[PDB]
Scaffold this active site. Sequence first.
Site, PDB file in Angstrom:
ATOM      1  N   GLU A   1     -14.913 -19.027 -42.798  1.00 52.25           N
ATOM      2  CA  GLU A   1     -14.316 -19.852 -43.826  1.00 52.25           C
ATOM      3  C   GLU A   1     -15.382 -20.393 -44.785  1.00 52.25           C
ATOM      4  O   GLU A   1     -15.910 -21.490 -44.584  1.00 52.25           O
ATOM      5  CB  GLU A   1     -13.437 -20.953 -43.181  1.00 52.25           C
ATOM      6  CG  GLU A   1     -12.465 -20.359 -42.122  1.00 52.25           C
ATOM      7  CD  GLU A   1     -11.499 -21.358 -41.500  1.00 52.25           C
ATOM      8  OE1 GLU A   1     -11.434 -22.526 -41.941  1.00 52.25           O
ATOM      9  OE2 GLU A   1     -10.791 -20.956 -40.554  1.00 52.25           O
ATOM     10  N   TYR A   2     -15.724 -19.632 -45.831  1.00 51.05           N
ATOM     11  CA  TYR A   2     -15.162 -18.317 -46.176  1.00 51.05           C
ATOM     12  C   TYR A   2     -16.323 -17.523 -46.768  1.00 51.05           C
ATOM     13  O   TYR A   2     -17.275 -18.129 -47.266  1.00 51.05           O
ATOM     14  CB  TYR A   2     -14.083 -18.417 -47.266  1.00 51.05           C
ATOM     15  CG  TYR A   2     -12.985 -19.420 -47.009  1.00 51.05           C
ATOM     16  CD1 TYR A   2     -13.058 -20.708 -47.544  1.00 51.05           C
ATOM     17  CD2 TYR A   2     -11.881 -19.090 -46.224  1.00 51.05           C
ATOM     18  CE1 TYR A   2     -12.054 -21.637 -47.315  1.00 51.05           C
ATOM     19  CE2 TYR A   2     -10.873 -20.017 -45.980  1.00 51.05           C
ATOM     20  CZ  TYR A   2     -10.965 -21.287 -46.535  1.00 51.05           C
ATOM     21  OH  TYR A   2      -9.976 -22.210 -46.299  1.00 51.05           O
TER      22      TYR A   2
ATOM     23  N   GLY B   1     -15.518 -18.552 -35.155  1.00 53.72           N
ATOM     24  CA  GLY B   1     -15.852 -19.337 -36.340  1.00 53.72           C
ATOM     25  C   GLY B   1     -15.019 -20.591 -36.504  1.00 53.72           C
ATOM     26  O   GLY B   1     -15.056 -21.490 -35.659  1.00 53.72           O
TER      27      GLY B   1
ATOM     28  N   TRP C   1      -0.660 -22.353 -36.779  1.00 54.20           N
ATOM     29  CA  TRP C   1      -1.700 -23.302 -36.432  1.00 54.20           C
ATOM     30  C   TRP C   1      -1.044 -24.660 -36.167  1.00 54.20           C
ATOM     31  O   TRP C   1      -0.576 -25.291 -37.104  1.00 54.20           O
ATOM     32  CB  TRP C   1      -2.734 -23.450 -37.554  1.00 54.20           C
ATOM     33  CG  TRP C   1      -3.901 -24.281 -37.084  1.00 54.20           C
ATOM     34  CD1 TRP C   1      -3.979 -25.656 -37.037  1.00 54.20           C
ATOM     35  CD2 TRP C   1      -5.120 -23.790 -36.522  1.00 54.20           C
ATOM     36  NE1 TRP C   1      -5.187 -26.043 -36.494  1.00 54.20           N
ATOM     37  CE2 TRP C   1      -5.908 -24.917 -36.175  1.00 54.20           C
ATOM     38  CE3 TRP C   1      -5.635 -22.500 -36.294  1.00 54.20           C
ATOM     39  CZ2 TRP C   1      -7.195 -24.795 -35.619  1.00 54.20           C
ATOM     40  CZ3 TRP C   1      -6.907 -22.375 -35.740  1.00 54.20           C
ATOM     41  CH2 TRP C   1      -7.676 -23.522 -35.407  1.00 54.20           C
TER      42      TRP C   1
ATOM     43  N   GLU D   1     -17.087 -24.177 -25.397  1.00 47.71           N
ATOM     44  CA  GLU D   1     -16.815 -25.218 -24.397  1.00 47.71           C
ATOM     45  C   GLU D   1     -17.319 -24.832 -23.010  1.00 47.71           C
ATOM     46  O   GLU D   1     -17.314 -23.659 -22.654  1.00 47.71           O
ATOM     47  CB  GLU D   1     -15.323 -25.565 -24.340  1.00 47.71           C
ATOM     48  CG  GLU D   1     -14.753 -26.069 -25.662  1.00 47.71           C
ATOM     49  CD  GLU D   1     -15.348 -27.383 -26.111  1.00 47.71           C
ATOM     50  OE1 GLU D   1     -15.427 -27.600 -27.337  1.00 47.71           O
ATOM     51  OE2 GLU D   1     -15.738 -28.194 -25.243  1.00 47.71           O
TER      52      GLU D   1
ATOM     53  N   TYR E   1      -1.594 -23.115 -45.711  1.00 47.47           N
ATOM     54  CA  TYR E   1      -1.390 -24.534 -45.431  1.00 47.47           C
ATOM     55  C   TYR E   1      -2.593 -25.313 -45.959  1.00 47.47           C
ATOM     56  O   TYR E   1      -3.535 -24.702 -46.463  1.00 47.47           O
ATOM     57  CB  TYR E   1      -1.133 -24.786 -43.935  1.00 47.47           C
ATOM     58  CG  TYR E   1      -1.846 -23.842 -42.980  1.00 47.47           C
ATOM     59  CD1 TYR E   1      -3.235 -23.905 -42.804  1.00 47.47           C
ATOM     60  CD2 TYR E   1      -1.120 -22.915 -42.214  1.00 47.47           C
ATOM     61  CE1 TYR E   1      -3.887 -23.052 -41.895  1.00 47.47           C
ATOM     62  CE2 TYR E   1      -1.763 -22.061 -41.311  1.00 47.47           C
ATOM     63  CZ  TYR E   1      -3.139 -22.135 -41.161  1.00 47.47           C
ATOM     64  OH  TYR E   1      -3.763 -21.295 -40.267  1.00 47.47           O
ATOM     65  N   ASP E   2      -2.537 -26.647 -45.871  1.00 45.92           N
ATOM     66  CA  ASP E   2      -3.529 -27.557 -46.483  1.00 45.92           C
ATOM     67  C   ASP E   2      -3.598 -27.333 -47.983  1.00 45.92           C
ATOM     68  O   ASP E   2      -4.666 -27.450 -48.604  1.00 45.92           O
ATOM     69  CB  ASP E   2      -4.921 -27.407 -45.862  1.00 45.92           C
ATOM     70  CG  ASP E   2      -4.879 -27.351 -44.341  1.00 45.92           C
ATOM     71  OD1 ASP E   2      -4.330 -28.280 -43.722  1.00 45.92           O
ATOM     72  OD2 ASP E   2      -5.403 -26.375 -43.779  1.00 45.92           O
TER      73      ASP E   2
ATOM     74  N   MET F   1      -3.962 -18.243 -44.489  1.00 38.25           N
ATOM     75  CA  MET F   1      -3.943 -19.673 -44.191  1.00 38.25           C
ATOM     76  C   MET F   1      -3.176 -20.489 -45.234  1.00 38.25           C
ATOM     77  O   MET F   1      -3.746 -21.364 -45.914  1.00 38.25           O
ATOM     78  CB  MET F   1      -5.380 -20.196 -44.016  1.00 38.25           C
ATOM     79  CG  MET F   1      -6.111 -19.548 -42.841  1.00 38.25           C
ATOM     80  SD  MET F   1      -7.817 -20.098 -42.655  1.00 38.25           S
ATOM     81  CE  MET F   1      -8.704 -18.926 -43.604  1.00 38.25           C
TER      82      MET F   1
HETATM   83  N1  LIG Z   1      -5.985 -19.389 -38.938  1.00 35.67           N
HETATM   84  C1  LIG Z   1      -6.834 -20.414 -39.188  1.00 35.67           C
HETATM   85  N2  LIG Z   1      -8.172 -20.440 -39.033  1.00 35.67           N
HETATM   86  N3  LIG Z   1      -8.477 -21.684 -39.424  1.00 35.67           N
HETATM   87  C2  LIG Z   1      -7.368 -22.378 -39.820  1.00 35.67           C
HETATM   88  N4  LIG Z   1      -7.411 -23.664 -40.265  1.00 35.67           N
HETATM   89  C3  LIG Z   1      -6.433 -24.552 -39.624  1.00 35.67           C
HETATM   90  C4  LIG Z   1      -6.249 -25.861 -40.369  1.00 35.67           C
HETATM   91  N5  LIG Z   1      -7.583 -26.469 -40.768  1.00 35.67           N
HETATM   92  C5  LIG Z   1      -7.394 -27.715 -41.604  1.00 35.67           C
HETATM   93  C6  LIG Z   1      -6.495 -28.700 -40.865  1.00 35.67           C
HETATM   94  O1  LIG Z   1      -6.959 -28.723 -39.503  1.00 35.67           O
HETATM   95  C7  LIG Z   1      -6.245 -29.536 -38.658  1.00 35.67           C
HETATM   96  C8  LIG Z   1      -7.020 -30.456 -37.937  1.00 35.67           C
HETATM   97  C9  LIG Z   1      -6.400 -31.341 -37.048  1.00 35.67           C
HETATM   98  C10 LIG Z   1      -5.010 -31.302 -36.890  1.00 35.67           C
HETATM   99 BR1  LIG Z   1      -4.153 -32.500 -35.698  1.00 35.67          BR
HETATM  100  C11 LIG Z   1      -4.225 -30.395 -37.602  1.00 35.67           C
HETATM  101  C12 LIG Z   1      -4.850 -29.511 -38.494  1.00 35.67           C
HETATM  102  C13 LIG Z   1      -8.452 -25.489 -41.533  1.00 35.67           C
HETATM  103  C14 LIG Z   1      -8.684 -24.269 -40.665  1.00 35.67           C
HETATM  104  N6  LIG Z   1      -6.317 -21.589 -39.668  1.00 35.67           N
END
Ligand SMILES: Nc1nnc(N2CCN(CCOc3ccc(Br)cc3)CC2)[nH]1
Length: 373
Positions: free
Chosen positions: A119-120, A76, A339, A49, A191-192, A189
Amino acid sequence: YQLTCYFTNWAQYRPGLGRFMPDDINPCLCTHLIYAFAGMQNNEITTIEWNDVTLYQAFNGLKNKNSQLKTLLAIGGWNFGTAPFTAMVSTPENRQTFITSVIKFLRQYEFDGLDFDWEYPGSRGSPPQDKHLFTVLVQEMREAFEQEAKQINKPRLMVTAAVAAGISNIQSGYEIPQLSQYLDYIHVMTYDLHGSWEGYTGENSPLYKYPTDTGSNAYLNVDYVMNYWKDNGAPAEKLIVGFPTYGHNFILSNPSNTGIGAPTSGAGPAGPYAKESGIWAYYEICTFLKNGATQGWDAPQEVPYAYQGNVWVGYDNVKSFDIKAQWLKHNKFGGAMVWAIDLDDFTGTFCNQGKFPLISTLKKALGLQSASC
Ligand SMILES: Nc1nnc(N2CCN(CCOc3ccc(Br)cc3)CC2)[nH]1
């Protein structure tokens, strides 16, 4: 325990109440802050940025209010993809070029270390050789950091990495025992883990399996993923559990079918602040709840969900964060990462549970509340 919080440098562009700057961070909230993201040009770390230098100053300036605070720069991320990493690790010349730029960059802008967000390795276009080459890069970096510390007579820079939660991705990406040796922390990570891509409702970061999860679906939970990392070579103390301050939403195929694994017909609507297709920041979810969405609790997985009309969201709240934090303690993992800090209800105005209700929950639950400032 550590409480590691990611800040995102595009949060600045969200309209009105969504705008989040480094000075919106409570310096006393987390033990570690990670700045997402840096980029790469000609195998050297760069800003992305226009105002990153000014933001770096504000971000690392937070350490003037909390002497314990450490900061790291993340390189990244998801949209960055794999190509610049692949090219950079492909030759020892490119890795040294990169490592040299990193030492200079972190020292100049006053970061305490680097977080890798490749990733990744071994997937999303990255070839099989990148699994081992990532280990090599991390070793060489850790060894360069150790060397530099000797040259300038100061404690070394830290090296950490965000790592995959999907089993296939882990297997194709990481030499877990060798890699774990060189990293200071491993930010998993978790989540998702589910999303509209699957065609059924599912939780973002369920703690445990849902009873109907069999086969490869049985692996899509925090507990399985954290234990997979540990069982395959990462020391529990270096393992950091991922906590999302957001949820995934879905269009229900039938509004009368609202449980876990109900059919869906696509990604749910972007929120009015984060503007993300199929995803709502926690504070956005608070609006949904405040205006009468039906709330559900997924007991098997220890996480909330909510629905209204054709829209269904799987997410985390104060209750689910507390439950996971207790679990993390019982399993004696190194701590939690978040996150992202800009997706918590930082203003306190959306959920009316105080400022940073999700991250404050972790701070309290992890025994960090009496931490120094
Ligand atoms: N430690 C770390 N490195 N990278 C990540 N992740 C974060 C989540 N990401 C998918 C969802 O990403 C969003 C996008 C928008 C909103 Br609002 C909320 C989440 C993939 C990459 N974690």
